[PDB]
Amino acid sequence: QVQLVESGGGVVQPGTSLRLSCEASGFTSSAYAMHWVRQAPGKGLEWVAVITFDGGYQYYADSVKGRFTISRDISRNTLHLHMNSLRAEDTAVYYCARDPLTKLLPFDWVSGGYFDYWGQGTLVTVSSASTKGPSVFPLAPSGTAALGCLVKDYFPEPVTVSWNSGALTSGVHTFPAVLQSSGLYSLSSVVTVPSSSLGTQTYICNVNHKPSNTKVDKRVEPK
């Protein structure tokens, strides 16, 4: 059966080079136009490059031209994406895709081409992020009140949050972290409490970040 298996992905630093491979099987890639398509975490599909069945023509998205080169190892029935000068926004799953219609380029007539087969994808993470403990900030409450703790700029996952060491659990919601463009994570934990208890009751968030051996308590109070 037809299949595509991409390879070469990994976590690397900005400016670095990396070469992806896509081995074909069940057919000859020299008889098809082959493509690279990529998808950033949580984002949409983005076409990267095409090479013709001939190998005599390549084309590239503007975002990668001059940095990426698509090629074919005819002998090993393998396609390659050589990426130089990688940037943070190159972070994506990279897919190999087969196009049965495209022959010679540029097109003589309007393209009715499509991708009939995809590989499983290989992950490329471009980041300079390294182990770093979070800054912890109180989220002051304004017949209930919401209060919490902002856990800012840590790497890597995970962070865990408790309240009064886990003695306060009712109404606690700790949110999934956001992964920012910096490659650093942030999250928040909130607890909803009686408005009338804000004067007598004590609320402390406990933030743990094991990779940085960070254990921080922050008392959260009105005003």
């Binding site: 949580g42 599909l45 097109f107 309007v110 956001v178 928040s188």
Partner: protein
């Protein structure tokens, strides 16, 4: 060349899901549609504006006229829930639409609870400022977030999570707006606007 889709389409089982894709003179181009489930490769469901690959259920159909390409799923079932992307060409360049999340309803609809927090004093001291918009208990798990400084839309410094399931089977998401302490004081108001199934709710905080 730009292809735009709606972010979300929600449908009860058996009803018809209609997904549009817009572009300048899209009718002059051939449109393809791909189905993608979380953690899986995309799957071609429609090519050349209406042709259906073998193996694809015939409840999938497509059309393309003027500026609009439409993918139609009649009698939608749970297995049809996925992201759908339209696709076309610009010379040798391949173009994808923004993608549409199709939810097939499996529990009652639920409007989001929204909590907006201002920058803390402690953070403002460190010459940094973040707005924290927390969104909980909603279904379907699809939201769009818009930030506004006073009355003007802000797009810079915005980071928003993908929705994910809570331990009550509804969804949660959060959005962060990064600002300088000066930018924060320079306006009278900041708002977080959360849109869900045609309804938009807003929370507001001020440097006061």
């Amino acid at each position: 060349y730009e292809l735009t889709q709606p972010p979300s389409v929600s449908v009860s089982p058996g009803q018809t899901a209609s997904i549009t894709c817009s572009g300048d003179k899209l009718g002059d181009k051939y449109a393809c549609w791909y189905q993608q489930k979380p953690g899986q490769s995309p799957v071609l469901v429609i090519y050349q504006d209406s042709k259906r690959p073998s193996g694809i259920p015939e409840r999938f159909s497509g059309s393309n006229s003027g500026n609009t390409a439409t993918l139609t799923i009649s009698g939608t079932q749970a297995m049809d829930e996925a992201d759908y992307y339209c696709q076309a060409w610009d010379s040798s360049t391949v173009v994808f639409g923004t993608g549409t999340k199709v939810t097939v309803l499996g529990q009652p609809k639920a409007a989001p609870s929204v909590t907006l927090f201002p920058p803390s004093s402690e953070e403002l001291q460190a010459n940094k400022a973040t707005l924290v918009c927390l969104i909980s208990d909603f279904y379907p798990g699809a939201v769009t977030v818009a930030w506004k400084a006073d009355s003007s839309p802000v797009k810079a410094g915005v980071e928003t999570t993908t929705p994910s399931k809570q331990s009550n089977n509804k969804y949660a998401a959060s959005s962060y707006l990064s600002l300088t302490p000066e930018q924060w004081k320079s306006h009278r108001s900041y708002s977080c606007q959360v849109t869900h199934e045609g309804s938009t709710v807003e929370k507001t905080v001020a440097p006061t």
